[PDB]
Scaffold this motif. Structure first.
Motif, mmCIF file in Angstrom:
data_model
loop_
_atom_site.group_PDB
_atom_site.id
_atom_site.type_symbol
_atom_site.label_atom_id
_atom_site.label_comp_id
_atom_site.label_asym_id
_atom_site.label_seq_id
_atom_site.Cartn_x
_atom_site.Cartn_y
_atom_site.Cartn_z
ATOM 1 N N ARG A 163 1.298 -1.448 0.098
ATOM 2 C CA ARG A 163 -0.194 0.337 0.198
ATOM 3 C C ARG A 163 0.358 1.037 -0.330
ATOM 4 O O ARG A 163 0.427 2.273 -0.386
ATOM 5 C CB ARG A 163 -0.940 0.151 0.954
ATOM 6 N N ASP A 164 2.383 1.546 0.462
ATOM 7 C CA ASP A 164 3.104 2.337 0.488
ATOM 8 C C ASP A 164 3.557 2.821 -0.860
ATOM 9 O O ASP A 164 4.030 3.404 -1.480
ATOM 10 C CB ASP A 164 4.110 2.452 1.012
ATOM 11 N N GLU A 206 1.680 9.581 -5.732
ATOM 12 C CA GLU A 206 2.610 11.286 -5.904
ATOM 13 C C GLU A 206 2.582 11.700 -5.951
ATOM 14 O O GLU A 206 3.121 13.196 -6.231
ATOM 15 C CB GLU A 206 2.469 10.945 -4.016
ATOM 16 N N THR A 233 -5.481 4.391 -3.656
ATOM 17 C CA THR A 233 -4.679 3.874 -3.175
ATOM 18 C C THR A 233 -5.443 3.262 -2.546
ATOM 19 O O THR A 233 -4.837 1.689 -2.710
ATOM 20 C CB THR A 233 -3.379 4.557 -2.541
ATOM 21 N N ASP A 234 -6.209 4.007 -1.753
ATOM 22 C CA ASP A 234 -6.359 3.340 -0.322
ATOM 23 C C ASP A 234 -7.544 1.921 -1.386
ATOM 24 O O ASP A 234 -7.660 0.943 -1.185
ATOM 25 C CB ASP A 234 -7.245 3.702 0.046
ATOM 26 N N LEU A 262 -4.443 9.809 -2.572
ATOM 27 C CA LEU A 262 -4.648 8.615 -1.002
ATOM 28 C C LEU A 262 -6.078 7.977 -1.420
ATOM 29 O O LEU A 262 -5.546 6.562 -1.066
ATOM 30 C CB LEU A 262 -4.755 9.863 -0.023
ATOM 31 N N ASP A 263 -6.895 8.654 -1.529
ATOM 32 C CA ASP A 263 -8.063 7.595 -1.845
ATOM 33 C C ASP A 263 -7.647 6.931 -3.246
ATOM 34 O O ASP A 263 -8.237 5.610 -3.109
ATOM 35 C CB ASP A 263 -9.072 8.221 -2.260
ATOM 36 N N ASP A 308 -8.620 11.624 -4.831
ATOM 37 C CA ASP A 308 -7.745 11.890 -5.134
ATOM 38 C C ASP A 308 -6.301 11.047 -5.050
ATOM 39 O O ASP A 308 -6.102 9.699 -5.290
ATOM 40 C CB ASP A 308 -6.986 12.752 -4.133
ATOM 41 N N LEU A 311 1.626 3.948 -2.937
ATOM 42 C CA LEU A 311 1.779 5.713 -2.425
ATOM 43 C C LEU A 311 2.575 6.406 -3.336
ATOM 44 O O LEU A 311 2.023 7.025 -4.459
ATOM 45 C CB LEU A 311 1.764 6.565 -1.543
#
Lengths: 91, 91, 91, 91, 91, 91, 91, 91, 91, 91, 91, 91, 91, 91
Positions: free
Chosen positions: C5-6, C13, C53-54, C50-51, C48, C9
């Motif tokens: 999950r990182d 990003e 990636t989640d 973050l959402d 965006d 990102l």
């Protein structure tokens, strides 16, 4: 700030549009002291007198900028302009 | 991170506003090795040197980006910027 | 819990706001493996980074989510981020 | 999901911002076959390429969306993008 | 229980936040056949997609609810979601 | 709290809109000390001078932020802003 | 009672809403010591700084909560936040 | 992509600025085979060699673009440049 | 239910964002018949097209709302949308 | 209650949105008197002029709030609003 | 939708940028029949060909827009463009 | 409601964007009658013609607002829009 | 409000674009009395006459702003404009 | 609107590029009747014929603009152009 950004202008405002191009061209190959950068061609070959003065005082300093301008002016033949520039900067 | 993005910038800043457009136009038809995409015309014909170098290192990698830039520069005639880029990149 | 999950990102990003839109648009038509659902337009066209990636790790698992993100990034031409993601996730 | 939403994007990203406006203007008066609505003027004059592709595939289906895009591109002159779009969509 | 409550949901999650408002506004004036009431404007202009689907299947039955949703979707132009809804509901 | 957050602004606010872009671009490839992260590309290429100085003092520490700013400034040639930045931060 | 809940609140309150969301996202996958639970997704992605501080001090202890917060802050790049957090908590 | 976009450019850079205007003027009335459009006057009477070759390869295809350029070049008298263009294009 | 709530929408979605603000501004001082109220400034200068249509049909009636919208449209110059609204409402 | 909360507002409304950001940024590093706290960065970088006025009169008192606002305004260059604020508050 | 918005563009793209200014200036004082407004000077002196043709078909109708454009074109002397517009519009 | 809010608009829409800025700048120093406030600089230097007319009729009344607009227009030299405003407001 | 913001404008709007740059460049090194700040180089080299007058009266006061403008104009040669400014300001 | 904005154009469009400068220079010192402003040098020395006609009809009125143009034309020697301007404007 220092007044050297003005003495350069008064030296580059007396150049005709033909010998200003010669000044800019010779600025591309003049030897430089260590630690100082060189203006890229893309910007150098398009600036006018005011932009050139700003860039010269930006990359170099007051003293070295004035000295480099005087050396370039003397090397390309113009002696009275370099003389008055040195007179204005030294005192 | 690799320094190859700075080498491309140092080579794209020595091109005047006229052969930068020529470089961008040549970039639209240069042969590419397999697995690499082509920059679309919509964005290619509007970038300046900074955007162009960032985008070049984005699509292509550092090694291939530098090699492609050198190939395009040689193709359009400029042998001095191409040699400078090769010297900066290879070692 | 897995670290994938990182790595996603760090890949999403580094995209500009314009090419994040391209990523989300390409996510609506990429081929999908059997048994995996597709993110609806109403939510996908407003997330965006973050959402995104989640949700990517939610619908698709760690390995498949990372692989799908890499495939979409490589399809749209961005190979540096795709290679970075592949290196981060594979080992 | 059909890939025709991608082939349109590659056609709308290969044309400059000046002629994207011309494309959107031509889209306000192109004849439409029965049963298909017309994109409202308030949103059509503000969308960029990505929202334009999404809206085109939403209002008109994949087959008719690609056909209409090809016809509009041909009408306004560009027959290279129209040709590649037809080649991609038909096969 | 019939599955028609799900298909409608799959049609309303693909509508962005701006098209959902248009759908709710159009739902206030669409013609209705005899024996069916109209959703009051007080609650219609405040519910989200999930509540909208639930109340659509509440007031109107499965068949008529799906048919009305498809008709309203074609009315505003979006004929991709309308086609998906018809394909899901008829068979 | 340290006052060199004000000095960095004085160095970033004296840059034109073109050389600020070059500063941000060169901030993506400068070598970094161990334990210090790199600003993500997505947000770095869109923030102005105020956000830039805030995040420069946030990611790196106070003294290291000033020193890295000076390093980047000298690297691109501008040694007039770099010198005054050193003068402000060191004493 | 320990004042670590004050230091954590001070650390989390000086960072904007954009990186607060990133902090909450990375709190979902940071490695944890044995015997410590993980905050569920449903509550984590909705609470603000105050609730986050309370639940961080609740689930973990004062020492481990502060240390984990510092670790997450350093991981996401903010080295000024973690520095003052460690300075406050250690002594 | 075909290399004939580069063959045209080599033809349009070896002719002087006085006769580039003549080429553009002759391009306004040269007969065109069916199915191909004509460049509007407002855009045509202002482009330089690079924009002209881009738009020539855009409106017409590779083969027809090269053939039309050769026809116009022979019509206006220059036989050496047209012969070079045929040598580059046919094989 | 009257269909004039739809025709008005078709008039307020065919005009850009810079014309919608002008329409809302001119809706403040347009003469009104007796017995009809005026929309307050606080809500009028913030709502979009959909809320504008809803509140136009709420405060005024079907026929009067359509007629007032047409009068405001023709007073502000747009004759095509006004004629379209006339055609839609009268028959 | 003193009216000094208004004089601050009259100073924060006569400065543009670009330099309100600079004001808020320098508010994070201005030296503070003993016994007075510092506004948290998370809320500082999002408040508008009205919220900033309320916050300034809350954290600092009327006398010190006005003095600090004047000092920050003079530090950032604007000495027209600073003189007005001093005149309004002192007498 | 009528094709008159297409012919006008074909007449406004075939005239140079020097005389587009003359066309826009002449449009400020051309006599207008009753019931039609005049384009405000603020926006008229800034539009390009596409915005101009959209605005022309907006304020005036298809028939009157084409007739007025032809009249203005004949007024300034350009007869062939006006003849082309008349041929395209009348039949 | 008075029509003076329209006569002002027709005066502020008939002047270019360059001299709209001059109008707004001169509005900061024009002498004012007793009992009337002055528009703050923060909002004045950002609003367009529509917001300017709205706030002009808000702060000053219809009669004084039109009179002040005409005074400023003659002050900055435009004797045509000022005379038109005179004629529109008095009769 | 003082009228000196209008006297300066009439001095800066009456000089050509080539010497406006010279004025802005001389403004970067003119001596200033103690307690007055210097306009940052980044914004100074991009603003036009109106913004220049606004910020000149912003950083400096009415009297000192007029005096500094007159001194700079006298230094760079223009005696007519400086005399006009002095006559307008003193009485 | 009055036709005098056209006749002036016909008087200024017949001026060569050299005598247009003389016209604009003599416009800087021609006596003016009371109540009329003078065009600033900043714009007067850069406008071409079209902007000059627009500016003349804006600063002065129809009748006075035509009369002033005729007087200036007679003063600088050009008599036939002044005669035709009088013939057009008077009747």
């Amino acid at each position: 700030m220092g007044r050297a950004r003005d003495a350069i202008l008064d030296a580059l405002e007396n150049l005709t549009a033909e010998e200003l191009k010669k000044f800019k061209l010779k600025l591309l190959s003049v030897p430089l002291r260590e630690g100082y950068g060189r203006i890229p061609r893309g910007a150098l070959l398009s600036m006018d007198a005011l932009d050139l003065t700003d860039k010269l005082v930006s990359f170099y300093l007051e003293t070295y900028g004035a000295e480099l301008t005087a050396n370039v002016l003397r090397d390309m033949g113009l002696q009275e302009m370099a003389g008055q520039l040195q007179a204005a900067t030294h005192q």
